Design an enzyme around this catalytic site. Structure first.
Site, PDB file in Angstrom:
ATOM      1  N   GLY A  98       0.794  -1.214   0.201  1.00  0.00           N
ATOM      2  CA  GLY A  98      -0.034  -0.062   0.100  1.00  0.00           C
ATOM      3  C   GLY A  98       0.716   1.245  -0.024  1.00  0.00           C
ATOM      4  O   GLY A  98       1.989   1.384  -0.314  1.00  0.00           O
ATOM      5  N   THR A  99       0.146   2.263   0.481  1.00  0.00           N
ATOM      6  CA  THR A  99       0.937   3.692   0.312  1.00  0.00           C
ATOM      7  C   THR A  99       1.571   3.936   1.770  1.00  0.00           C
ATOM      8  O   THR A  99       1.371   3.195   2.675  1.00  0.00           O
ATOM      9  CB  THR A  99       0.011   4.913   0.105  1.00  0.00           C
ATOM     10  OG1 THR A  99      -1.229   4.673   0.919  1.00  0.00           O
ATOM     11  CG2 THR A  99      -0.383   4.918  -1.288  1.00  0.00           C
ATOM     12  N   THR A 100       2.710   4.775   1.469  1.00  0.00           N
ATOM     13  CA  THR A 100       3.242   5.113   2.816  1.00  0.00           C
ATOM     14  C   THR A 100       2.468   6.160   3.455  1.00  0.00           C
ATOM     15  O   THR A 100       2.142   6.968   3.105  1.00  0.00           O
ATOM     16  CB  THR A 100       4.694   5.751   2.476  1.00  0.00           C
ATOM     17  OG1 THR A 100       5.569   4.592   1.433  1.00  0.00           O
ATOM     18  CG2 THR A 100       5.403   5.736   3.847  1.00  0.00           C
ATOM     19  N   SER A 133      -4.088   2.535   4.534  1.00  0.00           N
ATOM     20  CA  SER A 133      -3.242   2.148   3.635  1.00  0.00           C
ATOM     21  C   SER A 133      -3.377   0.722   3.245  1.00  0.00           C
ATOM     22  O   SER A 133      -4.088   0.019   4.316  1.00  0.00           O
ATOM     23  CB  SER A 133      -1.750   2.095   3.860  1.00  0.00           C
ATOM     24  OG  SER A 133      -1.371   3.767   3.783  1.00  0.00           O
TER      25      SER A 133
END
Lengths: 241, 242, 231, 229, 249, 244, 102, 244, 236
Positions: free
Chosen positions: B28-30, B73
């Site tokens: 996922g995203t940070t 995320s």
């Protein structure tokens, strides 16, 4: 086969799925020790904070179910909060319908039945946590009851939990064989805390800090927790003995 | 074997379906969260997969209550549903007790909920880690919630591909201020370590979003960062990494 | 048959595989392309007949005079979502005396699909929507994935050979945003965008279906000898 | 079922050319006994609507929940979902209306009468009336309760039609509102001396003037008569 | 969802419902317990085993009360019995204390409990419990009775029987000691002597649970002064008393 | 595998059970449908599988209502449930509005029923775990669009057709449909066209004891023709094969 | 006690023409001898050249118009932009009324 | 999953036959014998237990014989445990008939009902059937004495004499060769005992292994008196027929 | 429970339908022949073993009306459920609509029971094929239908279902006309008898004949009545 994947008997009459539930409480590396004092019950337990970036004040294995009954949990933390919640609802339940606070004995029995019900279904996963309930009751006196995933429970003079709990058990058994009674004599609960720490240090081979311990004390009509400062006071008193 | 449901258990003492779900958020995203004295500052990396997108329109920051920030995320639809349930919880508490839910109370409730879907073969677990916090009368709180149903107190937390890059800097930041630090200054920080966790996302480009809940500026409500303050932070992080 | 016969089982890759399969319905399926300025939104859909003795199938559904959706995947899956969006939009008019907003209708839809993919025995819906509309915030153009996640763009495509259409829209990106007050230009540019998606599927005057919504324009579907104003 | 238990008095309100004005007294009475004073009945939503709630005080709380609930639900999903998906007094109106109607069907209503007074984003005047029944209407000059026929006529004395709204200014209205509250206090037993006053302007936002007292009363003719007749 | 409503009891291709056979195996992995029926009482006995030496066998209950005049004791799985005794009590109350008012006949209650066993071999999401119960009791109608409830969901009256891992040896023991006329005291001696051979630990009276459904005892009711009404015919023997009994074998 | 499940993909990317449904239209006796703007005709093949079969009260022509007619081809057990639901739909419109229901919208109503696969997805009451295996030629007349002919699939998708042939001989019939359909047909030329294509796929002989014709018309309603008329048109067909 | 009816009065008049119709009504709204408001019309256009007035008690009267307009919408949505007959309208409204007759 | 742990147990086989029913008949052949014979003065039910142990009390065991009502009793052959549930359902159905019609239930009705339950288990729910076979002794006023045998599939068949349980082959033939239609209760009492001694699972038939019961019309006025004999009266009649 | 037992087969079939039809083969065998004034449903009775009473062996032909009967081929357990359900629907028509039932009405009703359990999951359909025969009141035309556990119905004028239906069918091809039924009741009865003596066998023991004539005339003929016809058949 597939009598090991759902909770149905084998040609031995054994539920392997249930046995596995015990095998997961060693994976958090938490030990606890609980002894009955003279007018109290003390439980001391490990607190793992592996980082700074974990805030140590929050890392709690101690959940108050009642005003008078503490619960210390050994094993995975999701299942701990789940088990705590059920137990809290049931304690409140009984106070409402029976007009006094739920007995420790009856609460242990209750969770045992619910545990059996989670192994009665064939798509329900047993709650793998091992639960210690500590109390001072006014009818049963100082009490420890430890319930387990299968839904077996039994009373306790003292008890330990964790991957390394045989050693702890050995210590406690020998003590009650010299003393020849089922609870430690002293008369200040503070010194029962100190004694409990000494046995723990012997058992696991490590001296603990004020943030390697978290301590819970049940006296008459009450349960509370010691703060990290109070615990440091105890470790000075190790010197003083 | 032991990889076909979430109510098998292995002799190892491990549940792999559940463990596997943490890997979902690992792609996922940070996202980071700095626990402050006055509040919390969240920041989230938003990956840019083309330039047809409209930046700061694609929300991952949803507010739950009037004072709890939530940013997540992992698998996006899943996380939006997790927040969906939590808004119902907020209203219910308000209805019965007539006060906004506390920060620890909300953390509790979400843990129960994520527990439920790993106990039955008839519902599917989530694939998100969520980061949420705020200010109440017990102080500022920060929590990260795994798809296992685990949370703890957090001085600083992160997740995503660059959770390693983020956390390494947060250790040094407690060295800089062993007394914790102000929310207002942590805005500039928040940008800094997403840029540092974009060095694991250095074959892509990114949009920075920042949100805050602090008692010393916004009166303890969760709001967005935007405008002049936002571009000061963007400029800060740039010059440092250059 | 471990993780591909169940709709309840993860997946250490952090997936559900069914969603990828449901996204392959879009490759085999029809193509539609949306693009917006700041004052109008436009859908250009490639209609497709079943054979040559068949009328070509309508691919745009009117949800309200400020809202429309278009499919590119399975039709029976689209039938659930069209009903749901109309229901929520009418509910907004009844209760709040409001248009329903574009972003918000996407959010309702997302969490709907999610709890039918959660429930064992369910399915993820395999139709991808472009949801356009004009609300107070101006125009909006959402891309709706089989995951359910919603994304906001100025121009987007899905279906078979949607990749070339995004190349085309990224190049004309700054052109059609700085045209305002003329929906015509956008439609011409949209025809060019879906011509980057042909495979000898030609664009005729009865293959081309246009839909617009404006500030001063209702939701209107152009068809017939009235799409030949933009050819 | 639901009959009156604890019951407030009246909300009075009118338009001027650049905003609207609304006021109410602080009362929950228990009949002739004025059992609770200091009970606040004006509730702001944003700086673009003040809602005056009249009728039963019990039900007033169940709409204060719903107002809080409404703001949070509008603010959920986009951080742009309350800035340009911004609430309008018409939206707040419809919400309360429709819910109330369905609750009335269950034969357990939300026993109230509300005026929703605000200004739009364009700055047109919005003044509209709803009640538990679901009876709605607009007027340049509005009231609720006993004030529907008590206080409201004096206001409507200045403004006989709605092509006369731009001929009414802030300072002509202001005076009439003070006086109509005095009429209300004069000739209704259930009321309070304490009264609160709000002004919703589209050129200053909301300006709140709290705990005004009913002054300029006339009593000098209360001693030039001896006997009941 | 709910897709588990297919029975988890099935037949084998060689006949014989396989699930209840496995459940009957768990009783041979269980503890030993026995009941000897006298002609003026019944005695039931079991051994207490724990997984700890710090465990309390003073809050451990393997002999439990259903109604004053009827007791139960198991062999098999602990957890299974822990929920099952509660369901036995519950049906006895809802169907014979709210409908028929008085404490049920022994025969009646045994039938009712066997129905719950049956209904765990019919439905999905449930497989049966793997204990066998001895339900000893007395009613004033059919006299003294001793029954055995199966994990199949059947019942049998016995003259004397055992269940547990040492059941086969125990019924062979009881063959020569048994007689159609017994005293209650002599029954105690026979019962504990058979269970000493079915325990491979040490055999104490602190770790052996003894109960009789023998003589009435009024003062355990809770009141006195009406003798037409008594107290429990069940009477659990405290530990020191059992120690006296070890000498009486 | 993936047809062992009730709702599962399928590395192809679309469901499997649905395919096998389409391959169950090949188990039916032909149904042919020709549309013009003078009426729409449905003819059906009754198919003697046994010489002792009575075929004169077996009907695959079913009335939905006076202004909408239907022919079924494929597995006809599935169609029995569908004809009941459709009948109710039409009548519900006539109750709610006292107006004629469009042909398109009716077909859509039946397509909603074809949608029921899955068992725990959407909020409706699930009453199968599978899709159907039968296709319909719903013919009709509505007052908006004029005369209409529709093909409904066990997918839950519909298309308006101007000529469609379904059944076992669907593809070989459709090849002829492509060439012979034109807009200068009238009601009766369309009728003979049914009989022309139906004869090719008739395994026995064409006569009026294994075929039935039916029309839907605006100005006479739904009329199922008697065997006399069917026989006469069959004799008139053979005179154009002798004009070649 | 709670009685959920009233009389908000007003009057309406409908006349059929040759190729026209007129539907008229006053804008006076009252609740006994009270005049609540001088101005609130009661004839709303519903689109597609039906005009509807539900007159008498205002709460019920408004309810009808809302629900009818909802039905107009669904008509265009599911019959593919179908023209709405006066006739068709009448039958539908009757179902709304009969639905609440308890 | 949940379809991952089901292999499908209650479908048909490729001979049209239910897996679970076929397995059930085998498990009932494990269980002890029970024979029913109908005299023109009565019906004799005679059952041999499937368990006989070292110190099993069988002197009061009423574990095969059950009165369903005061004119209908059953003999049980199969699982005693499985049988329980249906035994009490039958009691309820019988009392219901008396409660609402003021009349005793016919034998036909009561059996047909229980058969329906068995059929119902494989029809719905995924549930297995109870592995039971019953022999019904019943009196009604419409067919007089009726004898029935029912199987785990849910079907009933009449008999004049029939056997279930262990060793049905041997027993059935001997019954055919020796039974006459003019036998009495006396004759039938002796015939049942002789047949059970050719099918005894020990090497001898003993009085405490016998449950024996009659329904006799010798009770006054033609009333039927059901008698389940005491253990001393079974021993009494067993020395009379000269086995022991 | 909703885990399907009905699951699509790779041949455009369903496993449970195919199995149902197998069970109809393996089971009892019914022949139906209609005259110009009667219906005859004859079905195999199961009494082959010695010493059985045939008044308490299952009825293989059950009257639902005063002139509509239901006969079956296939299993003997699955079929009783349908008999009971058919009776209720007949009585329902007569309560709420009026008018003794038509044969067609009941034909469609039985097929409508088959469709539910096929299309639904968690259930399996009956393995029963039925001969629905009788009259419509006010009409003197006899009507012979068959329905099969697929849920399809088709009209016939002679039919057979069950074991060795191929054999029975071929006999009726030379001695039956599709367009001219029998004009006499006794000949219809004797033709149904002659077909049953092929498969079933062993005298008139296992033979049944039910006759329905109009005016609401139902008679069941015991086996001894059938003996007399059989000897004439052999002599001929």
């Amino acid at each position: 086969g597939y009598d090991r994947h759902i909770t149905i008997f084998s040609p031995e009459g054994r539920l392997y799925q249930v046995e596995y539930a015990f095998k997961a409480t060693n994976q958090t590396n938490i030990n606890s020790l609980a002894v009955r004092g003279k007018d109290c019950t003390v439980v001391i337990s490990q607190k793992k904070v592996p980082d700074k970036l974990l805030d140590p004040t929050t890392v709690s294995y101690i959940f108050c179910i009642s005003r008078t009954i503490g619960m210390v949990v050994n094993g995975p933390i999701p299942d701990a909060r789940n088990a705590a919640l059920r137990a809290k609802a049931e304690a409140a339940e009984f106070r409402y319908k029976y007009g006094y606070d739920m007995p420790c004995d009856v609460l242990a029995k209750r969770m045992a039945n619910l545990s059996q019900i989670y192994t009665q279904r064939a798509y329900m996963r047993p709650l793998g946590v091992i639960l210690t309930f500590v109390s001072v009751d006014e009818e049963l006196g100082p009490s420890i009851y430890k319930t387990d995933p299968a839904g077996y429970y039994v009373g306790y003079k003292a008890t330990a939990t964790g991957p390394k709990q045989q050693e702890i058990t050995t210590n406690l058994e020998n003590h009650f064989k010299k003393s020849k009674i089922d609870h430690i004599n002293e008369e200040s609960w503070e010194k029962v805390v100190e004694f409990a720490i000494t046995h723990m240090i012997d058992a696991l081979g490590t001296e603990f800090s004020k943030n390697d311990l978290e301590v819970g004390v049940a006296t008459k009509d009450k349960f509370f927790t010691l703060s990290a400062e109070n615990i440091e006071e105890r470790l000075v008193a190790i010197a003083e003995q | 074997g032991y990889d076909l449901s979430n109510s098998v258990f292995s002799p190892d003492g491990r549940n792999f379906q559940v463990e596997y779900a943490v890997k979902a958020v690992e792609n996922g995203t940070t996202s980071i969260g700095i626990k402050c004295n006055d509040g919390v500052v969240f920041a989230v990396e938003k990956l840019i997969t083309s330039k047809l997108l409209v930046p700061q329109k694609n929300v991952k920051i949803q507010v739950v209550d009037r004072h709890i920030g939530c940013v997540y995320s992992g698998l996006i639809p899943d996380g939006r549903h997790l927040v969906n349930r939590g808004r119902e919880e907020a209203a219910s508490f308000k209805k019965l007790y007539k006060t906004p839910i506390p920060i620890p109370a909300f953390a509790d409730r979400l843990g129960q909920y994520v527990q439920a879907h790993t106990l039955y073969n008839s519902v599917r677990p989530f694939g998100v880690s969520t980061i949420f916090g705020g200010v109440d009368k017990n102080g500022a709180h920060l929590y990260m919630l795994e798809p296992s149903g685990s949370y703890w107190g957090y001085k600083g937390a992160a997740t995503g591909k660059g959770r390693q890059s983020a956390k390494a800097e947060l250790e040094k930041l407690v060295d800089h201020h062993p007394e914790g630090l102000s929310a207002r200054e942590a805005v500039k920080q928040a940008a800094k370590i997403i840029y540092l966790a974009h060095e694991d996302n250095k074959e892509k480009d990114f949009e920075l979003e920042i949100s805050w809940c602090s008692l010393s500026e916004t009166n303890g409500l969760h709001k967005f960062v935007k405008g002049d303050l936002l571009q000061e932070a963007i400029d800060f992080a740039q010059k440092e990494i250059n | 048959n471990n993780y591909d016969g169940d709709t309840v089982t993860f997946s250490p890759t952090g997936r559900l595989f069914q969603v990828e399969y449901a996204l392959e319905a879009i490759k085999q399926g029809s193509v539609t392309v949306g693009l917006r300025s700041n004052t109008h939104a436009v859908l250009v859909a490639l209609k497709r007949n079943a054979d040559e003795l068949s009328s070509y199938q309508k691919k745009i559904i009117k949800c309200d005079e400020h809202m429309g959706l278009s499919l590119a995947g399975l039709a029976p899956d689209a039938r659930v979502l069209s009903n749901y969006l109309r229901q929520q939009c009418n509910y907004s008019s009844l209760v709040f005396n409001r248009k329903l907003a574009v972003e918000r209708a996407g959010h309702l839809l997302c969490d709907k699909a999610q709890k039918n993919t959660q429930s064992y025995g369910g399915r993820p819906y395999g139709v991808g929507l472009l949801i356009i509309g004009y609300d107070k915030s101006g125009a909006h153009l959402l891309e709706f994935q089989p995951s359910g996640n919603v994304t906001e763009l100025y121009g987007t495509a899905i279906g078979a050979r949607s990749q070339g259409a995004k190349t085309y829209l990224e190049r004309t990106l700054d052109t059609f945003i700085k045209i305002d007050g003329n929906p015509d230009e956008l439609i011409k540019a949209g025809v060019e965008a879906i011509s980057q998606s042909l495979r000898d599927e030609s664009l005729t005057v009865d293959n081309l279906s246009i839909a617009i919504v404006g500030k001063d324009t209702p939701f209107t579907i152009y068809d017939g000898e009235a799409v030949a104003k933009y050819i | 079922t639901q009959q009156p238990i604890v019951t407030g008095t009246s909300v009075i309100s009118m338009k001027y050319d650049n905003g609207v004005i609304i006021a109410a007294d602080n009362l929950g009475s228990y009949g002739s006994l004025l059992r609770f004073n200091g009970v606040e009945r004006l509730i702001p939503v944003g700086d673009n609507t003040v809602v005056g709630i009249s009728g039963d005080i019990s039900d007033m709380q169940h709409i204060e929940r719903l107002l809080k609930d409404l703001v949070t639900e509008n603010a959920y999903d986009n951080p742009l979902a309350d800035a340009e998906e911004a609430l309008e007094p018409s939206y707040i109106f419809e919400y309360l209306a429709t819910v109330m109607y369905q609750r009335r069907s269950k034969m357990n209503p939300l026993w109230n009468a509300i005026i929703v007074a605000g200004v739009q984003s364009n700055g047109d005047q919005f003044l509209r009336y709803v009640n538990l029944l679901g009876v709605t209407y607009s007027s340049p000059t509005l009231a609720t309760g006993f004030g529907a026929h008590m206080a409201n006529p004096l206001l409507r004395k200045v403004v006989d039609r709605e092509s006369d709204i731009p001929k009414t200014t802030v300072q002509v209205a202001e005076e009439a509102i003070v006086n109509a509250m005095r009429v209300l206090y004069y000739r209704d037993a259930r009321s309070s001396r304490n009264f609160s006053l709000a002004i919703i302007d589209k050129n200053t936002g909301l300006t709140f003037k709290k705990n005004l007292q009913v002054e300029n009363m006339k009593w000098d003719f209360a001693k030039d008569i001896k006997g009941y007749g | 969802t709910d897709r588990y409503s297919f029975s988890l009891t099935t037949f084998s291709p060689s006949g014989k419902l396989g699930q209840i056979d496995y459940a009957l195996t768990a009783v041979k992995q269980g503890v030993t317990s026995l009941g000897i029926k006298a002609t003026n009482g019944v005695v039931i006995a079991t051994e207490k085993k724990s997984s700890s030496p710090l465990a309390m066998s003073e809050t451990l209950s393997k002999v439990s009360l259903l109604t004053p005049d009827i007791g139960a004791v198991y062999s098999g799985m602990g957890p299974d019995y822990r929920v099952l005794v509660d369901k036995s009590r519950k049906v006895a109350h809802t169907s014979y204390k709210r409908i028929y008012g008085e404490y049920p006949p022994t025969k009646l209650l045994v039938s009712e409990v066997a129905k719950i066993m049956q209904e765990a071999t019919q439905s999905g999401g449930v497989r049966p419990f793997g204990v066998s119960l001895l339900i000893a009791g007395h009613d004033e109608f059919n006299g003294f009775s001793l029954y055995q409830v199966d994990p199949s969901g059947s019942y049998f009256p016995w003259k004397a029987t055992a269940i547990g891992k040492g059941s086969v040896a125990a019924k062979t023991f009881l063959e020569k000691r048994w007689n159609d006329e017994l005293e209650l005291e002599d029954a105690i001696h026979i019962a504990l002597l058979t269970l000493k051979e079915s325990v491979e630990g040490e055999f104490n009276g602190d770790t052996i649970e003894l109960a009789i459904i023998g003589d009435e005892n009024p003062d355990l009711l809770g009141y006195t002064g009406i003798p037409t009404d008594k107290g429990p015919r069940f009477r659990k023997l405290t530990s020191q008393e059992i120690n006296d009994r070890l000498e009486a074998l | 595998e993936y047809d062992r499940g009730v709702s599962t993909f399928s590395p192809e990317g679309r469901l499997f059970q649905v395919e096998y449904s389409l391959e169950a239209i090949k188990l039916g006796s032909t149904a042919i449908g020709i549309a013009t703007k003078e009426g729409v005709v449905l003819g059906v093949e009754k198919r003697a599988t046994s010489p002792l079969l009575e075929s004169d009260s077996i009907e695959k022509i079913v009335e939905i209502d006076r202004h909408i007619g239907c022919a079924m081809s494929g597995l006809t057990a599935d169609a029995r449930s569908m004809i009941e639901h459709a009948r109710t739909a039409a009548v519900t419109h006539n109750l709610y509005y006292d107006e004629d229901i469009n042909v398109e919208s009716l077909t859509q109503s039946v397509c909603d029923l074809a949608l029921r696969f899955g068992e725990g997805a959407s909020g409706e009451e699930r009453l199968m775990s599978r899709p159907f295996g039968v296709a319909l030629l719903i013919a009709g007349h509505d007052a908006d669009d004029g005369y209409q002919l529709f093909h409904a699939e066990p997918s839950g998708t519909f298309y308006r057709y101007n000529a469609k042939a379904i059944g076992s001989g669907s593809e070989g019939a459709q090849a002829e449909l492509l060439n012979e359909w034109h807009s200068s047909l009238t009601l009766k030329e369309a009728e003979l066209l049914v009989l022309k294509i139906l004869k090719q796929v008739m395994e026995e002989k064409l006569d009026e004891n294994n075929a039935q014709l039916s029309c839907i018309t605006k100005q006479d309603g739904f009329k199922i023709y008697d065997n006399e008329k069917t026989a006469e048109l069959i004799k008139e067909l053979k005179e154009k094969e002798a004009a070649e | 006690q709670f009685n959920p009816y009233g009389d908000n009065g007003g009057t309406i008049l409908g006349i059929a023409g040759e190729d026209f119709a007129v539907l008229a009504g006053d804008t006076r709204n009252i609740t006994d001898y009270s005049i609540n408001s001088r101005y609130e019309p009661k004839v709303f256009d519903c689109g597609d050249n039906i005009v509807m007035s539900a007159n008498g008690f205002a709460a019920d009267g408004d309810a009808l118009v809302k629900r009818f307009k909802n039905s107009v919408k669904w008509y265009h949505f599911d019959h593919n932009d179908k023209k709405l007959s006066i006739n068709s309208a009448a039958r539908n409204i009757q179902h709304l009324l009969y639905g609440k007759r308890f | 999953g949940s379809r991952r742990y089901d292999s499908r147990t209650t479908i048909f086989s490729p001979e049209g036959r239910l897996y679970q029913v076929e397995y059930a008949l085998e498990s009932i052949s494990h269980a002890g014998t029970a024979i029913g014979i109908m005299a023109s003065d009565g019906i004799v039910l005679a059952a041999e237990r499937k368990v006989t142990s070292t110190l099993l009390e069988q002197d009061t065991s009423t574990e095969k014989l059950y009165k369903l009502n005061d004119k209908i009793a059953v003999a049980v052959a199969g699982l005693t445990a499985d049988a329980e549930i249906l035994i009490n359902t039958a009691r309820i159905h019988a009392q219901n008939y008396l409660k609402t019609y003021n009349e005793d239930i016919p034998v036909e009705i009561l059996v047909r009902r229980l058969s329906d339950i068995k059929q119902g288990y494989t029809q719905h729910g995924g549930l297995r059937p109870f592995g039971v076979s019953f022999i019904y002794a019943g009196y009604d006023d419409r067919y007089g004495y009726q004898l029935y045998t029912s199987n785990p599939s849910g079907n009933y068949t009449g008999w004049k004499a029939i056997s279930v349980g262990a060793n049905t082959s041997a027993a059935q033939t001997l019954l055919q060769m020796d039974y006459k239609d003019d036998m009495k209760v006396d004759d039938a009492i002796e015939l049942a005992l002789k047949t059970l001694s050719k099918t005894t699972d020990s090497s001898a038939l003993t009085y405490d292994r016998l449950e024996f019961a009659t329904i006799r019309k010798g009770a006054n006025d033609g009333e039927v008196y059901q008698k389940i004999f005491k253990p001393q009266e079974i021993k009494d009649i067993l020395v009379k027929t000269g086995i022991t | 429970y909703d885990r399907a037992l009905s699951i699509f087969s790779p041949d455009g079939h369903i496993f449970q339908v195919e199995y149902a039809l197998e069970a109809v083969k393996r089971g009892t065998c019914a022949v139906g022949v209609k005259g110009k004034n009667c219906v005859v449903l004859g079905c195999e009775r199961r009494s082959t073993l010695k010493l059985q009473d045939t008044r308490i062996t299952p009825s293989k032909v059950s009257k639902i009306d005063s002139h509509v009967v239901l006969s079956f081929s296939g299993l003997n357990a699955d079929s009783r459920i349908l008999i009971e359900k058919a009776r209720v629907e007949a009585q329902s028509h007569r309560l709420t609509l009026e008018d003794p039932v038509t044969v067609e009405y009941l034909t469609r009703y039985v097929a409508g029971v088959q469709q539910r359990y096929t299309q639904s999951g968690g259930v399996r359909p009956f393995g029963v094929s039925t001969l629905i025969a009788g009259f419509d009141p006010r009409d003197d035309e006899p009507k012979l239908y068959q329905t099969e556990p697929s849920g399809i119905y088709s009209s016939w004028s002679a039919q057979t279902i069950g074991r060795n239906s191929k054999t029975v069918r071929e006999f009726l091809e030379k001695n039956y006309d599709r367009k001219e039924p029998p004009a006499t009741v006794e000949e219809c009865v004797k033709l149904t008898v002659r077909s049953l003596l092929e498969v079933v066998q062993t005298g008139a023991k296992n033979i049944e004949i039910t006759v329905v004539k109009p005016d609401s005339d139902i008679v069941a003929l015991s086996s001894e009545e059938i003996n007399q016809y059989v000897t004439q058949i052999e002599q001929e």
